């Protein structure tokens, strides 16, 4: 009878950097997606595996709500089968992903006057992330022939970099808040159900 705490996720006052993205396990609750359906101002709302028209008719063993901030231009990367700094080094969906991706422009919240430089992304990595892998390491990245020994310099780089969210920025350089709902189905009791 108690609704799933989608509010806690979507309406959170603070959001995670994409490199250190956040997870909320959602279980043992009714999922009324009408809280999402009645928002006309999400910039994207796409489901993979299920039609979004069926969400209220469906049950899952759990739902995971991954949330973070990226630039406008990078929101197309939060989809199965994408590549780029975000898909490759920050947050990776599986090719057979079942769930929904929702994003909205957050310039109103995530840009201050001096510019907001708190949100980071990973710029360099030895290899691409597996799906739902998460790396929060700050190992100096060895780009060249020669080793680094945790000291920075030529071909030895800090792996993270601030987004600069200035309120003057173009759409593609404005912050977007993203929530990824992963619908998990196991040989187990369905603990997350629509209101039928």
């Amino acid at each position, epitope marked *: 009878t108690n609704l799933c705490p989608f509010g806690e996720v979507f309406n959170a006052t603070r959001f995670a950097s994409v490199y250190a993205w956040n997870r909320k396990r959602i279980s043992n609750c009714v999922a009324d997606y009408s809280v999402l359906y009645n928002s006309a101002s999400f910039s994207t709302f796409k489901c993979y595996g299920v039609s979004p028209t069926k969400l209220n008719d469906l049950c899952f063993t759990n739902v995971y709500a991954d949330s973070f901030v990226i630039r406008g231009d990078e929101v197309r990367q939060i989809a199965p089968g994408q590549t780029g700094k975000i898909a490759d080094y920050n947050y990776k969906l599986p090719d057979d992903f079942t769930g929904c991706v929702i994003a909205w422009n957050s310039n109103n919240l995530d840009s201050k006057v001096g510019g907001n*430089y708190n949100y*980071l992304y990973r710029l360099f990595r030895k290899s691409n992330l597996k799906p739902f892998e998460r790396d929060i390491s*700050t190992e*100096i990245y060895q780009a060249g022939s020669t080793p680094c020994n*945790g000291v920075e310099g030529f071909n030895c*780089y*800090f792996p*993270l970099q601030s987004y600069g969210f200035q309120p003057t920025n173009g759409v593609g350089y404005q912050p977007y808040r993203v929530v990824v709902l992963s619908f998990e189905l196991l040989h187990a009791p369905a603990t997350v159900c629509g209101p039928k």
Partner: nanobody
Amino acid sequence: QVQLVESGGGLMQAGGSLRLSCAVSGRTFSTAAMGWFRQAPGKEREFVAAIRWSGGSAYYADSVKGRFTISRDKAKNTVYLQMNSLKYEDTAVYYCAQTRVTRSLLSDYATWPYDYWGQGTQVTVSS
């Protein structure tokens, strides 16, 4: 908000040594990198040295390289500038600076606008 207080400037003979401190206060969990800049009277400000707060890696301008050591104490919230083999060119007002901004290329900190500045401490290298 952070406040920066330089100390340890003054008079020294060329070929001698001085140690500048800068104490960071306010929202100190926000420090990404620190810098020292100098500005001789009537000449434009110049980058001296930068240190990444996490990791502690240093970038230096070519004019001070091998003479100056930037270093910091995360615990005591303080960045140091060890000035050895002082020269006439060194004479200037020294400013420490803080940015909350993470740049992958440590060299960026030479040219990148910092967020907060000290009032400065005067250094003067005797003839």
